[PDB]
Each structure stands twice: as structure tokens, then as C-alpha cells.
Swiss-Prot record:
It comes from Mus musculus (Mouse). It is a single-pass type II membrane protein. The chain holds residues 95 to 389 of 392 of the full protein. This is Xyloside xylosyltransferase 1. Alpha-1,3-xylosyltransferase, which elongates the O-linked xylose-glucose disaccharide attached to EGF-like repeats in the extracellular domain of target proteins by catalyzing the addition of the second xylose. Known targets include Notch proteins and coagulation factors, such as F9. The keyword Membrane applies. One of its GO terms (biological process) is O-glycan processing.
Length: 286
């Protein structure tokens, strides 16, 4: 038997209508289009407090190869995360309870060695293809690449990295694809836990003095959590990241097009190809 691990954040879902409506679109399309071989099993990890754990379990009964549904206690993971992720919530969430928004950063240390690879996924997603096909992207990783991630399709990191770009007008940091580095979107993340444990460079980038060192270089104080950490790391060391094709995460949010970046927005938003996963980020319908 071969295991395939998926992780989803499912917090504060109790009496939350828009979140439950999102999860219905996400989990339905995921399971309706999923097709695995008889010998292999799909594992669905959810991190939820006692309240939302009920909401999830009740929703999966309507929708359910073997597929094990695992539930992770929010507090247990938060308590485990905090001593490892404290030095970077003052930089990427510029207090204790908000350590769970950095789960992806230290997924390898939180998850058991029994699990080699996991895909963290948002709930504002729609799945247009089979999810087993995404796992194939792990094979396209270079040795020394730890994370699989799609690029950010909004000029978010123009404004975020403003001061660095003001000092380095030639830089690619914040520039649109393909020549520039637009940053990453954390909606769909292929986390190679095995590679994350084995990489000395990644092990050191998680250390306090290293986070500080690099954040000060870019004058970085963000608000996007784990996404900001990966994005900043991807500026110094882009070779740690296997950049997914945009079709794996076509983000639909057009906010910045109407709030400051009308001119350059398209260079970031552009994505030609048959969509495999839609990400209705910022409450955008699909
Ligand atoms: Mn999202």
C-alpha cells in the first residue's frame, strides 16, 4: 500500500457560512475527480479545533480507492509549532495562537517521519482534474528543491518589497514572470518533508538570526504568514523551490487591479493553459 497525504486548514468553521460554502466547492471537486489505484490510499489530514472537527466530519459523509480522514488538533500543532516559529511571526505577521499559520514552514518537524510528502491546500480552491496528477510534480523536483509552489499572480510583492526595489531598481525581486520573481502563493503547496529534513540550507533558514538577516536585507515586514517566508526565501534561494505551472493554482483575485496596479496587473495575472486548479482567493467566485 502507498499513501498520499493531503493537508487542509479547517478552523473557525462552526457557524461560518462562507467558509463552509467554500469547503463544499473544494472537497466535492477534489473527491469527484479523484482517481487512485486499488492498492494505494489517499490520506486527508485536517487541522481543526473540537468545534470545526464536527463540521468537517459531517461534510465528508455527504461526499465519501480508500481514503483515510485524519484529524489534527489545532492546539497540539500550535503548541508544537511555537518554539520553532516564534522568531518569524514578528517579520511575516508583523501572538502565540497565530503560530499555526506557519505550519507549512515547519511541516517536516511537526509531521511524523512515516510521512515523506504532503500537499497543503486551501479551501477556496476548485479542482478541475485528478489530484493524483499533482503528486507527479514531486518527481520534477530538482535535488535540493524542498517546496513545490505556484507563483503569486498579483503585484502584492511590488508593494511589500517597495523599499528594496527603491534601493535596487535593476532587481527582479517583485517583477512579473517570466523574467522577474513575483513571489509565491501558498494556496497549493507541495511539501517534500523528506527533502526539508535533509536540506542544511533550509534547516538554517528556519533559524532566528537567519530570518532576521534576510528580512533586514529586503526590509521585509509582511502580513501573509508562511507565504511571506517562502516568498522571501525564494528571492535569495529560488533553487529550493520547484515553481509549479500557473494552471495548478490559477488565482482569481483581481483586487490589486482596482487598487493601485491597473497597468502592470496583467503581467502578473496572465496564465495561458487548461486550468487544473482554480484558487478563488480573496472571496472571488469561480
Ligand atoms: Mn486561498
Amino acid at each position: 500500500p502507498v499513501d498520499y497525504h493531503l493537508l487542509m486548514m479547517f478552523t473557525k468553521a462552526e457557524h461560518n457560512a462562507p467558509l463552509q460554502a467554500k469547503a463544499r466547492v473544494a472537497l466535492s471537486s477534489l473527491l469527484r475527480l479523484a482517481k487512485f489505484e486499488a492498492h494505494e490510499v489517499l490520506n486527508l489530514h485536517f487541522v481543526s479545533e473540537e468545534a470545526s472537527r464536527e463540521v468537517a466530519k459531517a461534510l465528508l459523509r455527504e461526499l465519501l480507492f480508500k481514503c483515510k480522514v485524519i484529524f489534527h488538533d489545532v492546539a497540539v500543532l500550535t503548541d508544537k509549532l511555537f518554539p520553532v516559529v516564534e522568531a518569524m511571526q514578528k517579520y511575516f505577521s508583523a501572538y502565540y495562537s497565530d503560530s499555526i499559520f506557519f505550519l507549512s514552514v515547519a511541516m517536516h518537524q511537526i509531521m511524523p517521519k512515516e510521512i515523506p510528502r504532503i500537499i497543503q491546500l486551501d479551501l477556496d480552491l476548485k479542482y478541475k482534474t485528478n489530484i493524483r496528477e499533482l503528486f507527479e510534480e514531486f518527481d520534477n523536483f530538482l535535488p535540493g528543491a524542498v517546496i513545490g509552489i505556484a507563483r503569486e499572480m498579483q503585484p502584492v510583492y511590488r508593494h511589500t518589497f517597495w523599499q528594496f526595489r527603491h534601493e535596487n531598481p535593476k532587481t527582479r525581486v517583485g517583477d512579473p514572470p517570466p523574467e522577474g520573481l513575483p513571489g509565491f502563493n501558498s494556496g497549493v503547496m507541495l511539501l517534500n518533508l523528506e527533502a526539508m529534513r535533509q536540506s542544511p540550507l533550509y534547516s538554517h533558514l528556519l533559524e532566528p538570526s537567519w530570518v532576521q538577516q534576510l528580512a533586514d536585507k529586503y526590509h521585509f515586514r509582511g502580513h501573509l504568514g508562511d507565504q511571506d517566508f517562502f516568498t522571501m526565501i525564494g528571492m535569495e534561494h529560488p533553487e529550493l523551490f520547484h515553481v509549479l505551472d500557473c494552471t495548478w493554482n490559477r488565482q482569481l483575485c483581481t483586487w490589486w487591479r482596482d487598487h493601485g496596479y491597473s497597468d502592470v496587473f496583467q503581467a502578473y495575472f496572465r496564465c495561458e493553459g487548461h486550468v487544473k486548479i482554480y484558487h478563488g482567493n480573496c472571496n472571488t467566485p469561480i
